[PDB]
A paper describes a structure:
One of the better understood effectors is CfAvr4, a 135-residue effector protein from the tomato pathogen Cladosporium fulvum, which utilizes a carbohydrate-binding module of family 14 (CBM14) to bind chitin present in fungal cell walls and protect it from hydrolysis by plant-derived chitinases during infection. CBM14s are short modules of approximately 70 residues that bind explicitly to chitin, a long-chain polymer of β(1–4) linked N-acetylglucosamine (GlcNAc). Here we present the crystal structure in complex with chitohexaose of CfAvr4, a CBM14 lectin and the founding member of a fungal effector family that binds and protects chitin in fungal cell-walls from chitinases.
CfAvr4 bound in a 1:1 stoichiometric ratio with the (GlcNAc)6 ligand and the final structure of the CfAvr4-(GlcNAc)6 complex was solved at 1.95Å resolution, with R-factor and R-free values of 16.7% and 21.4%, respectively. The structure clearly shows four disulfide bonds that match the previously determined disulfide pairs of Cys40-Cys70, Cys50-Cys56, Cys64-Cys109, and Cys86-Cys101. CfAvr4 was crystallized with (GlcNAc)6 as an asymmetric unit consisting of two CfAvr4 dimers, with each dimer respectively binding to two (GlcNAc)6 molecules. The dimeric assembly creates a 2-fold screw-like rotation of each monomer, such that both sugar and protein are rotated 180° and translated by one sugar unit to create a molecular sandwich that almost entirely encapsulates the parallel-stacked (GlcNAc)6 molecules within its structure. Surprisingly, the CfAvr4 dimer interface is completely mediated by carbohydrate interactions and no intermolecular protein-protein interactions are observed across the dimer, suggesting that dimerization is a consequence of ligand binding. Contrary to previous assessments, the chitin hexasaccharide is accommodated in a shallow trench across the longitudinal axis of CfAvr4 with the face of the pyranose rings binding to the protein by means of nonpolar and CH-π interactions, and the ring substituents pointing into the protein core and forming hydrogen bonds with both the main chain and side chains. The main facial interaction between CfAvr4 and (GlcNAc)6 is a CH-π bond between Trp100 and GlcNAc-5.
Numbering used by the authors:
A (entry chain A): 35 to 113
B (entry chain B): 35 to 111
């Protein structure tokens, strides 16, 4: 019913435990991200909207998966 | 008995959620720090050693609590 980008294999493999695990862009906003909370053993998860600190924007790049300065973020709104 | 700098009142008041919360120096190493992971909802946490990026050292100063250039860090050495 709600938007839910939590990929099951990512949920099963990482258990969303590590510092970059199960973190996804929020389509509505560049200053938040979505973090998945596992609900069971088969990869289902509850998506949770999480805030970036003041001034920062989600950086979805491989190896990043963190809030970053806007000029380094993956916000689709640029220039 | 093993070393645990995680103070329960800080775990309780912050839930170790914020960007500077429940972060402590690692006495054994200037290139790592200790982060507290809560084990319950009533203040108990375990200490996890976390790495600084290569070449950086822990800065325990007030308002910092982050990995920093060596000349800015609080390393006792
Ligand atoms: C009892 C029990 O076990 N219960 C289980 C429970 O634990 C499980 O829940 C999971 O718990 C774990 C453990 O608490 C949670 O793990 C945490 O996850 C968050 C992310 O969600 C991690 O947060 C990241 O933290 C890293 C640092 O460790 C941050 O890295 C920093 O990023 C900044 C930029 O944002 C970098 O900044 C740059 O720095 C350079 C200089 O170095 C500077 O030049 C630049 O200017 C600067 N850029 C900017 C913009 O300032 C910085 O370098 C870097 N720091 C370092 C040291 O590299 C990163 O930003 C954080 N990311 C986000 C997002 O916040 C956190 O580390 C991690 N904790 C631990 C202890 O590892 C996990 O989230 C949680 N999962 C869930 C789903 O809740 C649950 C579920 O599995 O099960 C219970 O049973
Ligand atoms: C589903 C759910 O709810 N799960 C819960 C789970 O989320 C909870 O876990 C907690 O999650 C949160 C995120 O949600 C984690 O929060 C993160 O915490 C980390 C620290 O642990 C924060 O990391 C810092 O990030 C900032 C960027 O925002 C970094 O700041 C930069 O630091 C550099 C120095 O390293 C600064 O550069 C220096 O600047 C000075 C001054 O100008 C200059 O003099 C120096 O030369 C310069 N030095 C260098 C080397 O460049 C830079 O200015 C600054 N940037 C800015 C913009 O201020 C900082 O380095 C990072 N620190 C460390 C350490 O990595 C991170 O920001 C924060 N994320 C967010 C989104 O807030 C939290 O860690 C995690 N807790 C735990 C215990 O895992 C859990 C538990 O509560 O519960 C679940 O239920
Ligand atoms: Cl935004
Ligand atoms: Cl903001």
């Amino acid at each position: 019913q709600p938007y839910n980008p939590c990929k099951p294999q990512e949920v099963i493999d990482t258990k969303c435990m590590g510092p970059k695990d199960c973190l996804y862009p929020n389509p509505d906003s560049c200053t938040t991200y979505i973090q998945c909370v596992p609900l069971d053993e088969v990869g289902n998860a509850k998506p949770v909207v999480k805030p970036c600190p003041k001034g920062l924007q989600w950086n979805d790049n491989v190896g990043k998966k963190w809030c970053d300065y806007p000029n380094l973020s993956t916000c689709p709104v640029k220039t």
